[PDB]
Every structure is written in structure tokens, then in C-alpha cells.
Design a protein around this ligand. Sequence first.
Ligand SMILES: O=P(O)(O)OC[C@H]1O[C@H](OP(=O)(O)OP(=O)(O)O)[C@H](O)[C@@H]1O
Ligand SMILES: O=P(O)(O)OC[C@H]1O[C@H](OP(=O)(O)OP(=O)(O)O)[C@H](O)[C@@H]1O
Ligand SMILES: [Mg+2]
Ligand SMILES: [Mg+2]
Ligand SMILES: [Zn+2]
Ligand SMILES: [Zn+2]
Ligand SMILES: [Zn+2]
Ligand SMILES: [Zn+2]
Ligand SMILES: [Zn+2]
Ligand SMILES: [Zn+2]
Lengths: 218, 222
Amino acid sequence: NTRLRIAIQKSGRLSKESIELLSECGVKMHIHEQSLIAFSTNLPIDILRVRDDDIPGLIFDGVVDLGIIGENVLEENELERQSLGENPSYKLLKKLDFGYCRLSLALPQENKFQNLKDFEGLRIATSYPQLLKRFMKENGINYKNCTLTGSVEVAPRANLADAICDLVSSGATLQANNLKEVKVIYESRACLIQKENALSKEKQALVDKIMLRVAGVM
Amino acid sequence: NTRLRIAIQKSGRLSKESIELLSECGVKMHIHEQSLIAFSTNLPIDILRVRDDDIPGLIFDGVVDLGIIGENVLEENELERQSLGENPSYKLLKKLDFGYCRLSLALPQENKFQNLKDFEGLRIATSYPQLLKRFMKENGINYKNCTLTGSVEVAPRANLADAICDLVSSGATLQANNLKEVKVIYESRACLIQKENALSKEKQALVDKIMLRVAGVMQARE
Ligand SMILES: O=P(O)(O)OC[C@H]1O[C@H](OP(=O)(O)OP(=O)(O)O)[C@H](O)[C@@H]1O
Ligand SMILES: O=P(O)(O)OC[C@H]1O[C@H](OP(=O)(O)OP(=O)(O)O)[C@H](O)[C@@H]1O
Ligand SMILES: [Mg+2]
Ligand SMILES: [Mg+2]
Ligand SMILES: [Zn+2]
Ligand SMILES: [Zn+2]
Ligand SMILES: [Zn+2]
Ligand SMILES: [Zn+2]
Ligand SMILES: [Zn+2]
Ligand SMILES: [Zn+2]
């Protein structure tokens, strides 16, 4: 197999815009329900539709050639890999102009918040435990972890946590759960990344062509 | 919280059978299919319906009191936590009589397989990278990892991997993807576990009561 492998989010925040970037770069393909692999009809390119949390790993492990992924997800998994004693590596090709969001600490609307110190001792629910951990350590604040993959914003109401650390874009989900954003700990946007090890000449040439197109398209 | 917290899978292999064990143990429940939070109507017990991969962590971190989880999922996350330099700990209360499955290596049906050595150099897709890693190390076999959270079985036919390491229950998914099971690396069943730090006397008394009922239920279901 000589086909370039690009991993994108199967469904979620980045899916639509990732597909549109690719088509704007002249990559034609049909996306409809394929469980894992879609095939460009005009170029030797395979689009792997995966859970976003898997994309950093696929790139670090050299399973795919390119990936489109949020900085937050990339950094969370990079930190996890580094904490296991590994050396995750990737090339950053381009910071993209979509997927804008921020990872923030949030409290029940009725809670008094003067200072970050108010998070001392608190149980904090998040899907990004490594990012949360690094931030709290850097700011000298002790807390108790609660790792949930979904429904993080329900954790205070379920009495699993006193607070949360979660992605915010519109702020609608925090509002719906009667929570308030008190401290941004990370700002994110989508990026295009490549695996570390050199591609074949053919593949690198196609990547350079796509990057011109991305640069051009931008 | 005076209420005992039990974490169970929201939806998947163990969800139905975990809810049924609880009702079979006399725990009456109000559930909202889409919701994290469920509660017992006749006992001071909160049922937290979550992704199964989250349950070992909630127990290790003492966020909940009890959890029902597959041994496979528990072991994978225990290894992960230990590999991060942490000290995950839990009490095993009971091995349960549902959630039977095995984590196995599988290859395309048409592949020749003589020996485990045939995995040397191969890209192996899995949702259980620590369990795979430990097994391959202990058998002296080098491989390339591919971590996927879902659709693991399609990785070979998508040319993402040469092989997979995945749970097999009925074998139907492997058959559907024209893959064959060549080596079992772990046998698994659901288990009931408890966080490490001592419960209050009243909570521990409720747990002991539930455990008696669990035993009775299991004998009665044979
Ligand atoms: O501020 P809002 O616009 O209400 O958005 C907030 C939601 O978006 C995030 O999920 P997201 O879909 O980004 O994560 P995922 O795609 O990884 O599930 C986060 O988990 C919130 O639920
Ligand atoms: O042999 P079969 O009966 O076809 O079963 C195989 C399926 O079971 C496992 O999923 P599961 O929901 O157990 O994994 P999870 O823990 O990721 O939810 C595995 O990923 C297969 O998809
Ligand atoms: Mg989403
Ligand atoms: Mg399942
Ligand atoms: Zn089509
Ligand atoms: Zn089509
Ligand atoms: Zn995700
Ligand atoms: Zn109701
Ligand atoms: Zn799962
Ligand atoms: Zn039995």
C-alpha cells in the first residue's frame, strides 16, 4: 500500500471542517458511515475516521501519516505518553483556523469564587486529567481528581465532584448545567500534524502538494 | 454523601446485566436511559452510569464506593496507572457470573499462523495497549502498536494494522470481519470491586448486606 493515510475525527467538533478542508485542498472522497476507512477517488489517500482521542497516538506510533486534531487532545495524550516514560514525537505542519475552544475550570453558579486558591482540596471532574494536573501543579494548588470521558458537566449535580475542568466554545453547556466559567487553563484550535519518521519520496511529495494547497486555501 | 455510590456501565456488554444483578439483589431503581445519575428508591444507594473505561479510575480515585467492571478493563487501567508512576488500589469483592469474554490476538482468516513468532514486526491494533504490551514483552515478541478505542476489528481490512488484540465473546465480530482467533492472552468476567479506603461503618454494613445477597443470587441462578 502506497496510499497516504490521513486520520480525522469520525464525528464531533472537527469532523465537518476537517472534511471541508480536505475537499478545498482538492481531495475528493465520499463520507457516509464508513466505520473506519474512506477512500479518495482522485488521489492515493485514505481518510481514517477515528475517535479524536486516538489521533495523537496514531501519529506518535507512525500508524498514519497525517492527522487533524485539536491542540488540547494532542497535548493531553502527549503528556500521558511522556508520563509513561515514552518520547512521543510529531511534526506540526499547520495551525488551522477552526476548532477554537478553551479548557476551563468551572464551578456551580452559586459558588463564591475569589481566587484559584478556592480550588484547594476540591474534587474536580475532567476528561483531560494530564492537562488539569500540570496546570494545578504549576499554580501550587492541591485537588482530587475525577476522570470522566463524558457528561463531565453533570458531575457536580451527581455529587461526584465540586467543580469541573472542561472544553467551552459557546458557553451553552455550562449555562445549561448552571455552572460558571472561572479560569481558562488552555486555549486550543485544530492543527495538522505528521508522523516523525520520514515518508517515502512519493508520499512526501503528495504532502508538500497538499500543504501548498492548505497554505493556498488559507 | 451518606449514600453509597455504585458505578456501572451506561450502555454496552455489562449494562443490562449489572442493572439486573442489582434488582436481583433487591435494589429497586429509577433509571433515565440517557442519564449519569440513577438512584435506588428503597436504599441509600446512587448508581452512576458511566463509560466502562472510567470505572477503574473512579474506584482508584475513591470517587465511588463500588463498581461493576470487566477484569480486562480493570487490568488495563491498573497497568496504565502503575505505568504513570501511580499506585492504583482496590478491593476485589466478587467475581461475577456474567461478562464472559477473552482478550485474544487475531489475524486475517487467510493468514498462515504457525507460531506467536509470526507476530514479530507486525502492526497490532487494540484498545488494550498495556495488556498487549505486557503480554508481548513476557513472550519476547517485538511489534508495532496501534491504539484504537473502537472499530478495532476493521483495522486489518482497512490496512491500518496486520493483526488485532481484542475482546471476543461470541466470536461473531471476528467472523463478520473474516478474522480468526489465534491466541488467548487473558480470560475475563465482570467483577464487583470496592475503593481502597475504609467506608464508614454504615456504608460497609450496607455493602456486607449487598454481598450476602449477591452470593444468594448467584447460587440461585445456577
Ligand atoms: O461551550 P459549548 O459550545 O456548549 O461546548 C461545550 C461542549 O463541547 C465539548 O465537547 P466536544 O464535542 O468539543 O468534545 P468531543 O468532540 O471530544 O466530544 C465539551 O465536552 C462540552 O460538552
Ligand atoms: O465476539 P463478539 O460477541 O462479537 O464480541 C466482540 C465485541 O465485544 C467487544 O466490545 P465491547 O463493547 O466489549 O468493548 P468496550 O469495553 O470498548 O465497550 C469488542 O470490541 C467487539 O466489538
Ligand atoms: Mg462532539
Ligand atoms: Mg461495550
Ligand atoms: Zn457517496
Ligand atoms: Zn458514495
Ligand atoms: Zn473525544
Ligand atoms: Zn424520571
Ligand atoms: Zn468502553
Ligand atoms: Zn457461578
